[PDB]
Paper text:
Bacterial enhancer binding proteins (bEBPs) are specialized AAA+ proteins that are required to activate the sigma54-dependent transcriptional complexes. As transcriptional activators, bEBPs function to catalyze the conversion of RPc to RPo, causing the RNAP-σ54 holoenzyme to isomerize and promoter DNA to melt, leading to transcription initiation. The ‘Glutamate Switch’ pair (E-N) was identified originally in PspF as the E108 side chain adopts different conformations in the presence of ATP or ADP, forming or interrupting the interactions with N64 (3,11,16,22,27).
The crystals diffracted to 1.6–1.8 Å and have the same space group and unit cells as those of WT proteins and are thus subsequently rebuilt and refined using WT protein structures as templates. We first compared the conformations surrounding the ‘Glutamate Switch’. In WT protein, when ADP is bound, E108 does not interact with N64 albeit in the ATP bound or APO state, E108 interacts with N64 (Figure 6A, (16)). In the mutant structures, on the contrary, E108Q in the ADP bound state as well as in the APO state also interacts with N64. The crystal structures of the E108Q therefore suggest that PspF E108Q variant could engage with RPc, irrespective of its nucleotide bound states. Such a conformation could contribute to the ability of E108Q to bind RPc and move RPc along the pathway of transcription activation despite its slow ATPase activity. E108Q, on the other hand, is hexameric irrespective of the nucleotide being present, suggesting that the reduced ATPase activity is due to a reduced hydrolysis reaction per se, and not due to gross defects in hexamerisation nor loss of nucleotide binding.
Author numbering: 9 to 81, 91 to 255
The structure:
């Protein structure tokens, strides 16, 4: 979430892309809300009453990924489960080259192939994928299929990292701090000192919004009082 102009521009882009049936590629670091953007593409589309299915490609080994996406024997895969809806594939760049070619087969031909006896399955799925890799760099290296990229990247949504939305950092920090005050029953958030603000604004936030929420919640809890402003931002609890 947030309100920097670069983020508002993303929301505008998403509102125009959502009604299309074309695949959308989301590029962004961890904690920038890629799955929320994918969900927004679905719910602003004509498919909104259909299924919204997610899969993280990085999480499964190659055989398990293959079966989870395309099914086997019956274990229906994620494409089948997303029929009439939207399938979100996260960490796309980790997909093995076998899975990449099979993904292209389903995209251009619009159907899954069955082992023996079973006829192929036709599927109608809107695809949204996400990564933080440099996919054109991977194409040059031969670790990502050029023909798949020629097809998947109809258009690209680039999510700005928190460090490039500096105006959003104190806005969101205040929001998360207030919510933590409610959780631990403090009567009022007593504010951030200038030292705290320097700490927040100078940090690069590799975990972006998710990390900001955790750091601020921990800091409010450790502070534990409404009697004076929060001075000590605990970035590293280790």
């Amino acid at each position: 979430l947030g309100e920097a102009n670069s983020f508002l521009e993303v929301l505008e882009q998403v509102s125009h892309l959502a009604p299309l049936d074309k695949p959308v590629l989301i590029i962004g670091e961890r904690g920038t809300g890629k799955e929320l953007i994918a969900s927004r593409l679905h719910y602003l589309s004509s498919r909104w009453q259909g299924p919204f299915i997610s899969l993280n490609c990085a999480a499964l080994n190659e055989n398990l990924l293959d079966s989870e996406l395309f099914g086997h024997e019956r274990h229906p895969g994620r494409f089948e489960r997303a029929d009439g809806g939207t399938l979100f594939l996260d960490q796309l760049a980790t997909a093995p080259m076998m899975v990449q070619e099979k993904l292209l087969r389903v995209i251009e031909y619009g159907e899954l192939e069955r082992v023996g006896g079973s006829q192929p399955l036709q599927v109608n799925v809107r695809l949204v994928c996400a990564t933080n890799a440099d996919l054109p760099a991977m194409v040059n290296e031969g670790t990502f299929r050029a023909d798949l990229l020629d097809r998947l990247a109809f258009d690209v949504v680039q999510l700005p990292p928190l460090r490039e939305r500096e105006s959003d950092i104190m806005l969101m920090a205040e929001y998360f701090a207030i919510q933590m005050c409610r959780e631990i029953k403090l009567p009022l958030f007593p504010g951030f000192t200038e030292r705290a603000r320097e700490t927040l604004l100078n940090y690069r936030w590799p975990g972006n919004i998710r990390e900001l929420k955790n750091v601020v919640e921990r800091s409010v809890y450790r502070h534990g009082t409404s009697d004076y402003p929060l001075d000590d931002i605990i970035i590293d609890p280790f």
